[PDB]
Enzyme design. Structure first.
Site, PDB file in Angstrom:
ATOM      1  CG  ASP A 254      22.682  45.259  37.847  1.00  0.00           C
ATOM      2  OD1 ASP A 254      23.294  44.435  38.559  1.00  0.00           O
ATOM      3  OD2 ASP A 254      23.109  45.651  36.742  1.00  0.00           O
TER       4      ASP A 254
ATOM      5  CG  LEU B 109      40.637  46.036  27.818  1.00  0.00           C
ATOM      6  CD1 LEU B 109      40.114  44.609  27.918  1.00  0.00           C
ATOM      7  CD2 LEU B 109      42.095  46.102  28.263  1.00  0.00           C
TER       8      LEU B 109
ATOM      9  CB  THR C 108      41.850  51.920  17.190  1.00  0.00           C
ATOM     10  OG1 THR C 108      40.587  51.829  17.867  1.00  0.00           O
ATOM     11  CG2 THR C 108      41.953  50.801  16.161  1.00  0.00           C
TER      12      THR C 108
ATOM     13  CB  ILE D   2      32.916  46.850  34.639  1.00  0.00           C
ATOM     14  CG1 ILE D   2      33.448  47.704  33.489  1.00  0.00           C
ATOM     15  CG2 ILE D   2      33.627  47.169  35.942  1.00  0.00           C
ATOM     16  CD1 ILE D   2      32.904  49.128  33.481  1.00  0.00           C
TER      17      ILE D   2
ATOM     18  CD  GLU E 184      56.088  36.148  66.700  1.00  0.00           C
ATOM     19  OE1 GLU E 184      55.416  35.526  65.853  1.00  0.00           O
ATOM     20  OE2 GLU E 184      56.021  35.915  67.923  1.00  0.00           O
TER      21      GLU E 184
ATOM     22  CD1 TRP F 249      56.332  37.850  71.068  1.00  0.00           C
ATOM     23  CD2 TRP F 249      56.739  36.492  72.799  1.00  0.00           C
ATOM     24  NE1 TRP F 249      56.801  36.661  70.564  1.00  0.00           N
ATOM     25  CE2 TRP F 249      57.059  35.810  71.605  1.00  0.00           C
ATOM     26  CE3 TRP F 249      56.914  35.834  74.023  1.00  0.00           C
ATOM     27  CZ2 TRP F 249      57.541  34.499  71.597  1.00  0.00           C
ATOM     28  CZ3 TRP F 249      57.393  34.530  74.018  1.00  0.00           C
ATOM     29  CH2 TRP F 249      57.701  33.876  72.808  1.00  0.00           C
TER      30      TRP F 249
ATOM     31  CE1 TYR G  99      59.233  29.580  68.720  1.00  0.00           C
ATOM     32  CE2 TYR G  99      58.733  31.257  70.362  1.00  0.00           C
ATOM     33  CZ  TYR G  99      58.406  30.079  69.702  1.00  0.00           C
ATOM     34  OH  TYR G  99      57.248  29.389  70.003  1.00  0.00           O
TER      35      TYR G  99
ATOM     36  CB  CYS H 284      54.957  26.957  70.086  1.00  0.00           C
ATOM     37  SG  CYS H 284      53.452  26.099  69.665  1.00  0.00           S
ATOM     38  CG  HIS H 285      57.019  28.624  65.618  1.00  0.00           C
ATOM     39  ND1 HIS H 285      58.257  29.152  65.323  1.00  0.00           N
ATOM     40  CD2 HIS H 285      56.330  29.606  66.247  1.00  0.00           C
ATOM     41  CE1 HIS H 285      58.313  30.403  65.747  1.00  0.00           C
ATOM     42  NE2 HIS H 285      57.156  30.703  66.312  1.00  0.00           N
TER      43      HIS H 285
ATOM     44  CD  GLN I 190      52.208  25.355  65.659  1.00  0.00           C
ATOM     45  OE1 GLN I 190      52.047  25.651  64.470  1.00  0.00           O
ATOM     46  NE2 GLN I 190      51.365  25.730  66.611  1.00  0.00           N
ATOM     47  NE  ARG I 191      56.423  23.231  72.647  1.00  0.00           N
ATOM     48  CZ  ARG I 191      55.412  23.567  73.444  1.00  0.00           C
ATOM     49  NH1 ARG I 191      54.372  22.749  73.620  1.00  0.00           N
ATOM     50  NH2 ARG I 191      55.431  24.746  74.049  1.00  0.00           N
ATOM     51  CB  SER I 192      51.675  23.012  71.606  1.00  0.00           C
ATOM     52  OG  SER I 192      50.472  23.335  72.263  1.00  0.00           O
TER      53      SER I 192
ATOM     54  CG  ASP J 255      44.815  28.285  69.831  1.00  0.00           C
ATOM     55  OD1 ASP J 255      44.862  29.361  70.458  1.00  0.00           O
ATOM     56  OD2 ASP J 255      43.763  27.842  69.312  1.00  0.00           O
TER      57      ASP J 255
HETATM   58  N1  LIG Z   1      25.238  42.795  31.047  1.00  0.00           N
HETATM   59  C1  LIG Z   1      26.367  43.441  31.432  1.00  0.00           C
HETATM   60  O1  LIG Z   1      26.613  43.446  32.655  1.00  0.00           O
HETATM   61  C2  LIG Z   1      27.228  44.086  30.433  1.00  0.00           C
HETATM   62  C3  LIG Z   1      26.865  44.016  29.038  1.00  0.00           C
HETATM   63  N2  LIG Z   1      27.721  44.643  28.120  1.00  0.00           N
HETATM   64  C4  LIG Z   1      27.286  44.516  26.710  1.00  0.00           C
HETATM   65  O2  LIG Z   1      28.258  43.736  26.017  1.00  0.00           O
HETATM   66  C5  LIG Z   1      28.272  44.077  24.639  1.00  0.00           C
HETATM   67  C6  LIG Z   1      29.744  44.446  24.324  1.00  0.00           C
HETATM   68  O3  LIG Z   1      30.459  43.175  24.165  1.00  0.00           O
HETATM   69  P1  LIG Z   1      31.592  42.980  23.058  1.00  0.00           P
HETATM   70  O4  LIG Z   1      31.146  43.168  21.662  1.00  0.00           O
HETATM   71  O5  LIG Z   1      32.344  41.764  23.495  1.00  0.00           O
HETATM   72  O6  LIG Z   1      32.502  44.268  23.400  1.00  0.00           O
HETATM   73  P2  LIG Z   1      33.548  44.745  24.476  1.00  0.00           P
HETATM   74  O7  LIG Z   1      32.865  45.807  25.289  1.00  0.00           O
HETATM   75  O8  LIG Z   1      34.262  43.649  25.081  1.00  0.00           O
HETATM   76  O9  LIG Z   1      34.654  45.514  23.533  1.00  0.00           O
HETATM   77  C7  LIG Z   1      35.483  44.718  22.685  1.00  0.00           C
HETATM   78  C8  LIG Z   1      36.520  45.706  22.228  1.00  0.00           C
HETATM   79  O10 LIG Z   1      37.484  45.829  23.320  1.00  0.00           O
HETATM   80  C9  LIG Z   1      38.760  45.795  22.672  1.00  0.00           C
HETATM   81  N3  LIG Z   1      39.565  44.581  22.944  1.00  0.00           N
HETATM   82  C10 LIG Z   1      39.148  43.339  23.485  1.00  0.00           C
HETATM   83  N4  LIG Z   1      40.158  42.502  23.565  1.00  0.00           N
HETATM   84  C11 LIG Z   1      41.254  43.165  23.086  1.00  0.00           C
HETATM   85  C12 LIG Z   1      42.610  42.820  22.910  1.00  0.00           C
HETATM   86  N5  LIG Z   1      43.031  41.603  23.248  1.00  0.00           N
HETATM   87  N6  LIG Z   1      43.483  43.734  22.391  1.00  0.00           N
HETATM   88  C13 LIG Z   1      43.040  44.968  22.050  1.00  0.00           C
HETATM   89  N7  LIG Z   1      41.769  45.391  22.177  1.00  0.00           N
HETATM   90  C14 LIG Z   1      40.919  44.432  22.707  1.00  0.00           C
HETATM   91  C15 LIG Z   1      38.560  46.106  21.201  1.00  0.00           C
HETATM   92  O11 LIG Z   1      38.542  47.483  20.884  1.00  0.00           O
HETATM   93  P3  LIG Z   1      38.929  48.080  19.515  1.00  0.00           P
HETATM   94  O12 LIG Z   1      37.799  47.709  18.635  1.00  0.00           O
HETATM   95  O13 LIG Z   1      39.107  49.540  19.715  1.00  0.00           O
HETATM   96  O14 LIG Z   1      40.222  47.432  19.015  1.00  0.00           O
HETATM   97  C16 LIG Z   1      37.314  45.377  21.040  1.00  0.00           C
HETATM   98  O15 LIG Z   1      36.671  45.430  19.750  1.00  0.00           O
HETATM   99  C17 LIG Z   1      27.373  45.320  24.547  1.00  0.00           C
HETATM  100  O16 LIG Z   1      26.107  44.988  23.977  1.00  0.00           O
HETATM  101  C18 LIG Z   1      27.294  45.913  25.929  1.00  0.00           C
HETATM  102  O17 LIG Z   1      26.053  46.579  26.079  1.00  0.00           O
HETATM  103  C19 LIG Z   1      28.896  45.324  28.526  1.00  0.00           C
HETATM  104  C20 LIG Z   1      29.237  45.390  29.868  1.00  0.00           C
HETATM  105  C21 LIG Z   1      28.409  44.777  30.785  1.00  0.00           C
HETATM  106  C1  LIG Z   2      25.958  48.025  35.418  1.00  0.00           C
HETATM  107  C2  LIG Z   2      26.070  46.546  34.994  1.00  0.00           C
HETATM  108  C3  LIG Z   2      25.073  46.303  33.843  1.00  0.00           C
HETATM  109  N1  LIG Z   2      25.631  45.716  36.143  1.00  0.00           N
HETATM  110  C4  LIG Z   2      26.404  44.780  36.672  1.00  0.00           C
HETATM  111  N2  LIG Z   2      25.958  44.062  37.687  1.00  0.00           N
HETATM  112  N3  LIG Z   2      27.692  44.545  36.162  1.00  0.00           N
HETATM  113  C5  LIG Z   2      28.173  45.235  35.131  1.00  0.00           C
HETATM  114  N4  LIG Z   2      29.392  44.960  34.712  1.00  0.00           N
HETATM  115  N5  LIG Z   2      27.453  46.191  34.512  1.00  0.00           N
HETATM  116  O1  LIG Z   2      27.937  46.743  33.338  1.00  0.00           O
HETATM  117  C6  LIG Z   2      28.795  47.906  33.460  1.00  0.00           C
HETATM  118  C7  LIG Z   2      29.206  48.368  32.040  1.00  0.00           C
HETATM  119  C8  LIG Z   2      28.040  49.116  31.348  1.00  0.00           C
HETATM  120  O2  LIG Z   2      27.877  50.335  32.086  1.00  0.00           O
HETATM  121  C9  LIG Z   2      26.912  51.262  31.729  1.00  0.00           C
HETATM  122  C10 LIG Z   2      26.023  51.148  30.529  1.00  0.00           C
HETATM  123  C11 LIG Z   2      25.100  52.124  30.258  1.00  0.00           C
HETATM  124  C12 LIG Z   2      24.970  53.301  31.155  1.00  0.00           C
HETATM  125  C13 LIG Z   2      25.770  53.424  32.252  1.00  0.00           C
HETATM  126 CL1  LIG Z   2      25.593  54.835  33.306  1.00  0.00          CL
HETATM  127  C14 LIG Z   2      26.780  52.365  32.549  1.00  0.00           C
HETATM  128 CL2  LIG Z   2      27.820  52.523  33.963  1.00  0.00          CL
HETATM  129  O1  LIG Z   3      53.263  29.789  67.723  1.00  0.00           O
HETATM  130  C1  LIG Z   3      52.425  29.329  68.497  1.00  0.00           C
HETATM  131  C2  LIG Z   3      52.572  29.418  69.959  1.00  0.00           C
HETATM  132  C3  LIG Z   3      51.567  28.862  70.764  1.00  0.00           C
HETATM  133  N1  LIG Z   3      50.463  28.247  70.231  1.00  0.00           N
HETATM  134  C4  LIG Z   3      49.510  27.728  71.258  1.00  0.00           C
HETATM  135  C5  LIG Z   3      49.434  26.219  71.541  1.00  0.00           C
HETATM  136  C6  LIG Z   3      48.956  26.120  72.997  1.00  0.00           C
HETATM  137  O2  LIG Z   3      47.510  26.231  72.952  1.00  0.00           O
HETATM  138  C7  LIG Z   3      49.508  27.345  73.769  1.00  0.00           C
HETATM  139  C8  LIG Z   3      50.895  27.086  74.382  1.00  0.00           C
HETATM  140  O3  LIG Z   3      50.776  26.182  75.529  1.00  0.00           O
HETATM  141  P1  LIG Z   3      51.694  24.916  75.714  1.00  0.00           P
HETATM  142  O4  LIG Z   3      51.536  24.014  74.573  1.00  0.00           O
HETATM  143  O5  LIG Z   3      53.118  25.285  75.819  1.00  0.00           O
HETATM  144  O6  LIG Z   3      51.216  24.291  76.971  1.00  0.00           O
HETATM  145  O7  LIG Z   3      49.715  28.278  72.641  1.00  0.00           O
HETATM  146  C9  LIG Z   3      50.238  28.116  68.829  1.00  0.00           C
HETATM  147  O8  LIG Z   3      49.264  27.578  68.308  1.00  0.00           O
HETATM  148  N2  LIG Z   3      51.253  28.676  68.037  1.00  0.00           N
END
Ligand SMILES: NC(=O)C1=CN([C@@H]2O[C@H](COP(=O)(O)OP(=O)(O)OC[C@H]3O[C@@H](n4cnc5c(N)ncnc54)[C@H](OP(=O)(O)O)[C@@H]3O)[C@@H](O)[C@H]2O)C=CC1
Ligand SMILES: CC1(C)N=C(N)N=C(N)N1OCCCOc1cccc(Cl)c1Cl
Ligand SMILES: O=c1ccn([C@H]2C[C@H](O)[C@@H](COP(=O)(O)O)O2)c(=O)[nH]1
Ligand SMILES: NC(=O)C1=CN([C@@H]2O[C@H](COP(=O)(O)OP(=O)(O)OC[C@H]3O[C@@H](n4cnc5c(N)ncnc54)[C@H](OP(=O)(O)O)[C@@H]3O)[C@@H](O)[C@H]2O)C=CC1
Ligand SMILES: CC1(C)N=C(N)N=C(N)N1OCCCOc1cccc(Cl)c1Cl
Ligand SMILES: O=c1ccn([C@H]2C[C@H](O)[C@@H](COP(=O)(O)O)O2)c(=O)[nH]1
Lengths: 513, 514
Positions: A46, A97, A100, A152, A293, A315, A341, A401-402, A420-422, A424
């Site tokens: 994944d 996001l 802080t 993500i 066009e 054309w 046209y 046509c159109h 549109q008369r004709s 495709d």
């Molecule tokens: N299975 C998966 O594919 C994934 C799983 N995860 C898991 O999800 C969990 C995290 O989820 P969750 O707790 O929701 O955290 P998030 O990762 O969504 O982080 C939430 C934080 O994002 C910020 N935030 C969100 N909305 C706003 C807003 N409207 N304005 C300002 N800041 C905003 C805040 O930061 P701040 O606190 O700085 O204000 C907030 O506390 C984890 O356990 C992680 O491992 C994460 C990604 C993927």
């Molecule tokens: C990837 C994962 C779960 N897989 C899918 N299909 N979609 C996501 N959104 N993911 O989460 C991405 C955020 C978390 O990313 C990580 C968390 C721990 C280590 C590392 Cl290298 C990464 Cl990129």
């Molecule tokens: O803007 C256009 C111009 C042409 N045609 C198609 C319709 C017809 O298949 C062919 C034109 O042939 P006549 O209808 O004129 O015979 O081109 C369209 O769908 N759209």
């Protein structure tokens, strides 16, 4: 002059409020994700999946960089759970996001100093929630530089992403399930049951699910990956229609033996609100062509070469010397399509001579007039334009046509319906939806209105027998969330807009069929 | 001649009514019994009276049945036999008797005296077939439209045939009296199929009315009640529910006038035109005569509204008056001269306009004529459409087009049409528009060797006027009835020469003024 001046409300109407995002999470058979300080299991598989998903860019051979990479948002408690040696997460913009901790306060908790200068531009703290981060990420220096935004972790973070306004911006949920022999979690991750108010109106459906895999962690822990996406009923409209056309459409073969399945008369709707752009996901749409066009249409252009020069060859087959002549347009310079046209849109009825002559004040400028009415009398019911000029048809490389569009306004939003008369369904319609969505968007920006919705009316709606095989496959795909359109720059005049002034973001269409 | 559109030899064979629509009247006991095979087991004077009034009376008021205008009753020969000769035939109605053993003359000879059979000769006709053959006979020119309503009045065999295809699809209403008979022992039955069952054939019978329980003065205090069922009309429901949605969710908007409306943007409805069906709404009578006169008027490419007003069709008076015309700056137009509107664009698109009586023959693009030609040679062409929306001509029109675009499509010899209306007054405009374009498709079909298929209606600004909300809500109470049909009593050499009187709407039974 004869151009259309954008108002001073140009950018506000389409200013991105919050950036779209995806969610990644690992969960045990009970929905547990941690005990509040850490993750109670260790499945390296994944970890690799997570690394690759949130790190990799879609483009081929594109390696992350300040210019292009993905971002990762995490609660402060999750940042602390990551071993300092692994912070910040490489190749991605780490976003923390914290009410802080400050950006530098995070940079200080790191081992090296000759390293903190490299991560300076790779870490950022946000005094606020996920929503606050999504707004920060939507701004100009993060969008479209950041390709995808991934939530993500942090129980509270996941929780915020699953309630409005954030859920409406969630494109997908990547959830790994760990069948852990242990059960030591106090922080969970649960998706609201459908129909419930907690669901918001979203119905999450499985796009994919892996087989049951066995971890090499020494405990042979069983696990599997799963991808959930929000139901796109708008794209379903389109798939449903194609399917209906294929299953019940009338069969016809033209003078060449070219087969089609068709129905007559249909209508679809697409929202353009909040930057949404209805670019079908089940089959990629040539957005760059659509855009070049349309802009081309709005300028009232008729010379196709301006398109082919930009790599847009839609054309070419109809502007060739051969095709022009089969039309009797023997005197038209090659790639000169005639009064097609855009020309009718900006100069309806005007006499045509050759492409790029000056046509100031010639014919009726329908677009300019609709711009004016939209701003002064929005309830007007005559706000439409047409390219369907029976008088000029013969002079056209091709008949439109159109051919019709009507605008409507309510609650300060601009809506548009395309006729549109004709259609495709396979190769044209998606392109057409994109084309007119953009039109409505641009006209809205030019009139102090906000993008409303695109209503698409179809006459002869069809699927070419050939395309049947490909379409049946495309019909198996579950549509994905639609992308968004943003304007990186504005212009003084509507005619001066360029494809590069705008960008489609968060577009993740399916691969070729 | 060449400026007009010549109708083909198939002009009449295509809109030719195959079967005449009808209604059914029956009396059943609580176990669906209707008789013992020879007679009716009960005696309820009040039902006999209901039957008499229902099948004899013509719609409207003070209209007495006449040979040129009356109803018909179709019955099996055993039912005709069960009527005492002294009551045969049923007065005031054409008595149609099904039989493969008795001729019309034999029916006459079976009557009591000569004075009876001599006068009652144009009131009796026997058909050598079943109900279906009877309905085909009734569909002929001498019975349609002269016969207002056809009533199936009995014979278990006849009722059964009326309740199965092809006849059920033509059954517009079922008037059923239920007799709460103490004891019941019939051998011949009747029963309508429930919704969803195969025997119902997709028909969902609705109860339009049901009387209170009544007591017969037959001496036994026999209880009975009346019911009128109608085949659910989903098509009209499209319209009712759209009206209802606009009222409940529509946005408020105002005209230049200042008049308010409630509206929604973008909608679509479908209507079948198969087998002579004509979608005239029933929850509120539609002005068919005006619809027809105007549509023909469009087809001729007319622009002088006085041709309509001289025909009692004043729908254009308000917009062709000296006053309105001057308000539009069209002071060089004689009164009632509308400018190059609608039909002018259809037949002479782009032609310069001066005055309504100028010669425009061959000027501008004749879109109608061009479509008629493509329809006959290249039916699957995807460019068959005409438009009245001419940006160049708008400023010279009394008003810009409402229904501005129309596109045709063909499949299986059937003609379909798509209308695009930018602005739609649900209350007074839309029902009228649906009727005209349904008529258009039929005429074009008749002109191109095709059969009427469907009419698709696309709505732009769909609205209900504020001063109509209340009356509309009322109309929404009514359960829509079956749609009427359209038949031509004669044809013309040219499309432009058709007259409103050439055609007639039959079996149209709209609800009375709200
Ligand atoms: N299975 C998966 O594919 C994934 C799983 N995860 C898991 O999800 C969990 C995290 O989820 P969750 O707790 O929701 O955290 P998030 O990762 O969504 O982080 C939430 C934080 O994002 C910020 N935030 C969100 N909305 C706003 C807003 N409207 N304005 C300002 N800041 C905003 C805040 O930061 P701040 O606190 O700085 O204000 C907030 O506390 C984890 O356990 C992680 O491992 C994460 C990604 C993927
Ligand atoms: C990837 C994962 C779960 N897989 C899918 N299909 N979609 C996501 N959104 N993911 O989460 C991405 C955020 C978390 O990313 C990580 C968390 C721990 C280590 C590392 Cl290298 C990464 Cl990129
Ligand atoms: O803007 C256009 C111009 C042409 N045609 C198609 C319709 C017809 O298949 C062919 C034109 O042939 P006549 O209808 O004129 O015979 O081109 C369209 O769908 N759209
Ligand atoms: N409750 C009510 O409202 C009513 C009850 N009834 C009762 O119904 C019973 C009569 O029903 P039932 O026996 O079905 O008789 P019908 O009244 O249906 O008469 C059947 C006869 O009609 C003719 N017929 C029917 N179909 C065809 C056809 N396809 N081709 C040629 N001729 C056809 C035949 O005449 P032929 O034999 O000469 O060839 C046939 O035998 C009686 O008891 C009567 O009292 C009758 C009317 C109403
Ligand atoms: C009338 C009756 C049942 N009543 C209703 N509501 N519907 C019918 N179809 N009926 O049957 C008409 C055929 C039989 O008619 C008669 C039978 C005997 C005497 C007389 Cl005068 C008549 Cl009209
Ligand atoms: O065939 C017609 C003609 C007119 N109208 C209605 C629509 C509008 O309520 C009014 C015309 O006003 P504008 O849309 O032009 O503003 O008449 C119809 O519904 N159908």
């Amino acid at each position: 002059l004869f151009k259309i001046r954008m108002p001073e409300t140009v950018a506000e109407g389409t200013r991105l409020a919050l950036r779209a995002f995806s969610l990644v999470v690992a969960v045990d058979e009970h929905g547990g994700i941690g005990d509040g300080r850490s993750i109670p299991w260790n499945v390296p598989e994944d970890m690799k999946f997570f690394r690759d998903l949130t790190t990799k860019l879609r483009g081929k051979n594109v390696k992350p960089s300040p210019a292009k990479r993905n971002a990762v948002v995490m609660g402060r408690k999750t940042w602390d759970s990551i071993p300092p040696k692994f912070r910040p997460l490489p190749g991605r913009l780490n976003v923390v996001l914290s009410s802080t901790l400050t950006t530098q306060h995070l940079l200080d908790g790191l081992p090296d100093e000759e390293k903190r200068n490299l991560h300076a531009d790779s870490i950022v703290a946000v005094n606020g929630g996920l929503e606050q981060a999504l707004r920060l990420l939507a701004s100009p220096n993060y969008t479209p530089s950041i390709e995808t935004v991934y939530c993500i972790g942090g129980g509270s973070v996941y929780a915020e992403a699953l309630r409005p306004p954030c859920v409406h911006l969630l494109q997908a949920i990547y959830r790994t399930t760990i069948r852990a022999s242990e059960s030591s979690c106090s922080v969970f991750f649960r998706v609201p049951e459908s129909g419930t108010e907690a669901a918001a109106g979203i119905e999450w459906q499985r796009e994919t699910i892996s087989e049951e895999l066995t971890s090499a962690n020494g405990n042979e822990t069983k696990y599997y990956f799963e991808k959930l996406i929000p139901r796109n009923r708008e794209e379903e409209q389109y798939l449903s229609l194609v399917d209906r056309i294929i299953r019940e459409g009338n069969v016809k073969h033209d003078r060449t033996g070219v087969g089609t399945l068709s129905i007559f008369g249909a209508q679809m709707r697409f929202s353009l609100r909040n930057n949404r752009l209805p670019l079908l996901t089940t089959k990629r749409v040539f957005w760059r062509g659509v855009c070049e066009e349309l802009l081309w249409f709005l300028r009232g252009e008729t010379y196709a070469k301006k398109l082919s020069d930009k790599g847009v060859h839609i054309w070419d087959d109809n502007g060739s010397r051969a095709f022009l002549d089969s039309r009797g347009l023997t005197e038209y310079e090659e790639m000169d399509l005639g009064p097609v046209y855009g020309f009718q849109w900006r100069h309806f009825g005007a006499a045509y001579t050759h492409h790029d002559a000056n046509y100031d004040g010639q014919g009726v400028d329908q677009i300019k007039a609709i711009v004016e009415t939209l701003k002064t009398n929005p309830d007007d019911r005559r706000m439409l334009f047409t390219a369907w000029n029976p008088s000029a048809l013969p002079r056209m490389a091709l008949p439109p046509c159109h051919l019709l569009a009507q605008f409507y306004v309510s609650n300060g939003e601009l809506s548009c319906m395309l006729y549109q008369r004709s259609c495709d369904m396979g190769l044209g319609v998606p392109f057409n939806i994109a084309s007119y969505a953009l039109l409505t968007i641009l006209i809205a920006k030019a009139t102090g209105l906000r993008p409303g919705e695109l209503v698409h009316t179809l006459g002869d709606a069809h699927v070419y027998s050939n395309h049947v095989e490909p379409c049946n496959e495309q019909l198996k795909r579950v549509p994905r969330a639609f992308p968004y359109l943003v304007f990186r720059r504005e212009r003084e005049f509507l005619e001066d807009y360029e494809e590069g002034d705008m960008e489609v973001i968060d577009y993740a269409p399916y691969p070729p069929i």
